[PDB]
């Protein structure tokens, strides 16, 4: 499990900025912090982990101070730029911790400027990273004088992160360990070749295996697409295969997934199940 907090700040000009955050525990979202909201929102019933209400309110007040100070601090620091105040400015932060067994973990805090990684927090201090703009040297020196900020960040990375997260993992156990079954279906489009598509939708957790098969042979030309999210936090994936016309005959799409309890989905091209599916999904192509 990788716990990640992601902040995205946009600074258009001297008078306009916006900061938005999201928090992820593996691939489930646990928090949202919109720029228009004074407070961090829970996106799960268990998003408070094992912290008390007054403890949660203390962590939050801390971040509420951070969000205002970050904004003012950047607006000053952009005066120090190579051509001064080179708006628009995009800053991204990615902080968090990888959780391992049994209670072992590694923390990170990465910062990007214009889509480019430039700064990390490391041990006790901020560091520019190879290839960072030279004008960042003075800002980082200045920031590194703030030992109060540095003690807070160290405490967040070393202790608050892994501890908060071990409670989230306990409180969120049934959601994190949920199994949702993929449903599969077939279709085809032109490439004198055709392109066959196996659509696999609604699986959780994320790892699946989807291959085009001819009997027991794995068709090595199978191109597995990207994992695409659905709105209910299940996943969607298609696998495709380029075949000459009159060869769909005999191919199947096999799907293996933890939720299927040992019984794979196998869809044969041309099968009664496929024909009855295709009848339900006919359309005019314009």
């Amino acid at each position: 499990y990788t716990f990640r907090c992601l902040q995205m700040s946009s600074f258009a000009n001297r008078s306009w900025s916006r900061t938005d955050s999201v928090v992820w525990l593996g691939d489930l979202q646990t928090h949202r912090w919109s720029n228009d909201s004074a407070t961090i929102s829970f996106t799960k019933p268990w998003s408070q982990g094992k912290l008390s209400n007054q403890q949660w309110e203390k962590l939050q007040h801390m971040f509420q101070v951070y969000r205002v100070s970050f904004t003012r601090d950047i607006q000053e620091l952009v005066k120090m730029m190579s051509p001064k105040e080179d708006y628009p400015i995009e800053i991204q932060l990615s902080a968090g911790c990888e959780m391992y067994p049994g209670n072992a973990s590694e923390s990170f805090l990465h910062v990007a400027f214009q889509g480019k990684y430039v700064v990390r927090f490391w041990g006790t201090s901020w560091q520019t990273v190879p290839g960072a703009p030279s004008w960042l040297d003075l800002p980082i020196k200045v920031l590194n004088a703030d030992q109060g900020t540095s003690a807070t960040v160290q405490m967040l990375l070393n202790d608050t992160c892994p501890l908060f997260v071990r409670g989230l993992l306990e409180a969120g156990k049934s959601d994190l360990e949920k199994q949702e079954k993929p449903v599969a279906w077939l279709s085809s489009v032109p490439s004198g070749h055709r392109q066959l598509v196996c659509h696999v939708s609604g699986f959780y957790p994320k790892p699946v295996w989807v291959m085009w098969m001819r009997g027991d042979q794995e068709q090595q030309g199978t191109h597995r697409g990207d994992f695409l999210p659905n709105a209910d936090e299940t996943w969607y994936l298609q696998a495709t295969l380029d075949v000459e016309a009159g060869e769909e005959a005999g191919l199947a799409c096999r799907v293996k997934h933890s939720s299927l309890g040992g019984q794979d989905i196998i869809l044969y091209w041309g099968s009664l199940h496929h024909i009855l599916d295709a009848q339900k999904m006919v359309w005019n192509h314009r």
Partner: T-cell receptor
Amino acid sequence: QVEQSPASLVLQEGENAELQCTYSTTLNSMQWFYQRPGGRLVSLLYSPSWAEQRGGRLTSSAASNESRSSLHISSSQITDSGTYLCAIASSSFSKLVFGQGTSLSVVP
Amino acid sequence: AVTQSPRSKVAVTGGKVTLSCHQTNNHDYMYWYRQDTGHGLRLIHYSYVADSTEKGDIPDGYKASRPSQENFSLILELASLSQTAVYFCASRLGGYEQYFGPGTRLTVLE
């Protein structure tokens, strides 16, 4: 945005002085200055919010729940008479924002 | 640690006045403040590094120049009566505590 109080204080040599500085931001650092009229601005104390105070006749402390720090003068002498100015930085990037000062008169 | 010159100045309305501040602390920032009795300092201009200048809170009537790491000047191109004040230079590393110069009393007169 930085407030000092009282605006003036009179006291007898030997008495302790306490001077307040209230502010409405985060506290990176507090700097106190001493000045006689038409004189230079002399640094008395620099205290970052994370540093330990160094004991002596002149010290500072932050109020517990409150955005407020004090200057403490032990056993005031006639030569402590002058103006005391508070300045607050809110972060390592901000400006040093100055109060309007306390007039201290130590009388024999 | 921080010096200023001249120590004192009397000028006429419309005159050009230059105040100089000097430091060899290896400091990054330099500042110009004015003080009016009485008594908080107000920031006029400041600077991060050689050859750049940033406007403070009350920059109207003043220009600043940072010809090198060591030197920071405040220029009043057309002195006016409202510029009668004491001026303090200051410097700092990063980062840290501000060190102040001894001040210059300026009197602008008809």
